[PDB]
Amino acid sequence: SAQQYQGIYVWRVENFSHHLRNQEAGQPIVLHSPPFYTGRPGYKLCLRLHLQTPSAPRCSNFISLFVHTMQGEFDSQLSWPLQGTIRLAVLDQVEGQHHIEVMETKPDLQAFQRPTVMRNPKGFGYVTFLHLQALRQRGFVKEDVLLVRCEVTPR
C-alpha cells in the first residue's frame, strides 16, 4: 500500500570537510547512515556512502552511494523482495537543483531480499554517483553539511 512508501529520509552528513581532507590525503572514506523505514509498516533501509581515493581505478574522486536492506520490525507482514523505484539525491539547499539518480529494483538480486543478518552485505547503487569536483563546483555543501536523500516509491 501507499503508506508503506510514504517515508523520505534525509541523511545529514556533518563536518564534510573533514572527510574531504582525509580523502585528499589518500584515505578511502566509507560512511554508514542511520536506519530509516520506507513506511509504517514498511522496509528498514540504510545507506552506505564512499569517497573514493584520488587514485582508485575507474572511479577516482567519486562519491559512491548504495542502499542496503535491514531486518526491520514489520518484516513478517511485508512482501519480499522489496520492489519499487528508489530515488537517491544530493540536495541543493538553496537553488533546488538537486543531483538525483532514479533506479528500479531488480527482484533477482540479493540486495533486495531480507537479510539473514541485521544489515544486508549486498547493497545496490552507484559507484560513480557524484564526482567531488562537480560537488565542489555546484556548492552543494553548505555550512559543511552534505544532505543525501532517499525516497522509495511503489511499482
Partner: peptide, 8 residues
Amino acid sequence: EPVETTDY
C-alpha cells in the same frame, strides 16, 4: 551502473 556491491 547502478550495480550490486558487497560490503561486509
